[PDB]
Amino acid sequence: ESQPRQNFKVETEAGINRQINLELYACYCYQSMSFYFDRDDVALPGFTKYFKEKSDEEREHAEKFMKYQNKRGGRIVLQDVKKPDRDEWGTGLDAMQASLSLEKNVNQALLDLHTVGDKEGDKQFMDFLESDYLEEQVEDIKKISDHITNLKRVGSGLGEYMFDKKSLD
Amino acid sequence: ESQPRQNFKVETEAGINRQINLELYACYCYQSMSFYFDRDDVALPGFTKYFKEKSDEEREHAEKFMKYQNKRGGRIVLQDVKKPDRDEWGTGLDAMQASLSLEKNVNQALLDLHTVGDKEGDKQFMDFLESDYLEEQVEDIKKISDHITNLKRVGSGLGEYMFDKKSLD
Amino acid sequence: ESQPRQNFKVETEAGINRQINLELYACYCYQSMSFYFDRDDVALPGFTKYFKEKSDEEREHAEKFMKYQNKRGGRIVLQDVKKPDRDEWGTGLDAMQASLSLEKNVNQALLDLHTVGDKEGDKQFMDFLESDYLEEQVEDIKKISDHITNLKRVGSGLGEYMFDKKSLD
Amino acid sequence: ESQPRQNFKVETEAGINRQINLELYACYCYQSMSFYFDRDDVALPGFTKYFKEKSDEEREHAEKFMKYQNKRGGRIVLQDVKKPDRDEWGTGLDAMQASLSLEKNVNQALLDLHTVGDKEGDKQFMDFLESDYLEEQVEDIKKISDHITNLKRVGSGLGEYMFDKKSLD
Numbered sequence A, B, C, D: 001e002s003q004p005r006q007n008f009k010v011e012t013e014a015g016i017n018r019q020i021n022l023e024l025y026a027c028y029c030y031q032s033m034s035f036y037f038d039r040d041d042v043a044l045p046g047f048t049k050y051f052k053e054k055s056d057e058e059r060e061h062a063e064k065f066m067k068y069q070n071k072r073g074g075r076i077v078l079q080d081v082k083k084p085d086r087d088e089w090g091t092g093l094d095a096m097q098a099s100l101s102l103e104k105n106v107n108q109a110l111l112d113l114h115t116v117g118d119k120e121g122d123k124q125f126m127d128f129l130e131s132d133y134l135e136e137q138v139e140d141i142k143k144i145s146d147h148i149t150n151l152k153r154v155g156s157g158l159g160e161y162m163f164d165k166k167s168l169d
């Protein structure tokens, strides 16, 4: 039993290892999205920058879980991170819709991880998830939904072009 | 009779209490408008900010009347402020049209209040209304009418999107 | 079902709409208190400023709930905000005592809303209430209780006058 | 007929000469009040400074009427300014009460002067009175009434001493 370990169950420890893989997978997806909009036949630089920043955020999510795992005395066990499920992401609207579905899947996985901590009485782990992950997911899911509405509002062509300029930095 | 009271008729005092309620009602309407454009399925942040500022202006209108009531020796009597007459405000054009109708109703109520002061010989109250309310209403009604014209000019979709960016801060 | 909606129950959504009305009602009460101490026959400017700041805080409470409602995918439904239950608030001590009773009623309503979120498994909503509302209520209820003790200590007349100068900014 | 004279009736011109005398009389009263509280057997330096500032304000009122008289083409005719009706002004409360009665007498005289301008169709003179005199009188009468309430609240002795320190600069 590691020196720091206290009120930290193996099932909680295993759940954190699974979430690390998912955050790394989300990071991979956004990286793929970013460079897809960097293609010469797509060429939307706001979308490119937007998904690069989102990719880096997900990397921070994974590493903060790695750091937390060590803090509690758990042991990180890494797995293959799968390639994303598409090679091309359609229009800006399509990519944004994919991004919402991704964020909602990470959110449910986080809520499932909270439940493991709750049933195990991991009072600290629950507040860690609440403060550092659950709040951010809710903000991100709202922002992305707004983006979806506006990409539908502006339409294709010039509309998508201007959204790239005015809604993304 | 309160210490400051001089040339201040009960009918003028009652009129100010009625106007306080209306300014508070306008404030409530704009608050509702602001957060309606903050819905994920509306998501126009310029409209949201625009109506939040207008809501706060109306709150200032109500409180300045409360302050004036005390200055003259009157007594503030508050009433229920009704919920606004809609829960959803349509398009940006629809909301702007509603906002013009609201401002013109407050304006007529102010002009009716001026008439109470005029017939009662309340020379100071008349100039207070003129300087601090009538001028602002005329400016606001012109600004809103311009906004209506431009929302008709740009049309729905991308047009409404760009008005949100270029005409509202 | 709105785009962001996830782990957000209609009963939680309805509870937030009820709390919005209560925060708006508290805001109305403090506004009434503020201008009551601005009467020429009351004329305590520290109490006036103190309750104006408290009124604005309650307005922020209501609007942050409106913002949160939209974040989760709920729909804001506004209701009449009732006039406060008094037109005059007595002495500084009386007003402070009323203010404590008000804050404790909002607190219980918040704790009742936490229970709705808890039973529904709304992990994020619970931490939102904890971080942004429950902590502030506990601070405010302590501050007000201290004020009550000191208004009893100083007594009426000069004592109430000096409390207005030394305990309120 | 003087070069500037236009829409300026002799009755309006005579009314301004009467008001000049009254403003000068108010200035004299406040001067007497100021130095009364400077007596070694009164010795309240906040009251002394407070009435000195009020005296200087009244002097400005008289001179602005003198300036306005010349602007319209009227001719200033000065009269004896009577000594104030008391030589000693009692307590701080007594002096404040006298000061309220004085300000309300000047106010009624101003409202009577507005009526002369109104019946004569002196549109400019009416707004001059409104902007530069009527607003200030209403502010001053409210401030003084507040002071009366607080001098009653604190009582004699230490209370009057502390009002001199905390309510007057």
Ligand SMILES: [Fe+3]
Pocket (backbone or CB within 6 Å): A023, A026, A057, A058, A061, A106
């Ligand atoms: Fe993440």
Ligand SMILES: [Fe+3]
Pocket (backbone or CB within 6 Å): A054, A057, A058, A103, A140
């Ligand atoms: Fe994310």
Ligand SMILES: [Fe+3]
Pocket (backbone or CB within 6 Å): B023, B026, B057, B058, B061, B106
């Ligand atoms: Fe208004």
Ligand SMILES: [Fe+3]
Pocket (backbone or CB within 6 Å): B054, B057, B058, B103, B140
């Ligand atoms: Fe307005």
Ligand SMILES: [Fe+3]
Pocket (backbone or CB within 6 Å): C023, C026, C057, C058, C061, C106
């Ligand atoms: Fe609150």
Ligand SMILES: [Fe+3]
Pocket (backbone or CB within 6 Å): C054, C057, C058, C103, C140
């Ligand atoms: Fe509060």
Ligand SMILES: [Fe+3]
Pocket (backbone or CB within 6 Å): D023, D026, D057, D058, D061, D106
């Ligand atoms: Fe004067």
Ligand SMILES: [Fe+3]
Pocket (backbone or CB within 6 Å): D054, D057, D058, D103, D140
């Ligand atoms: Fe004066």
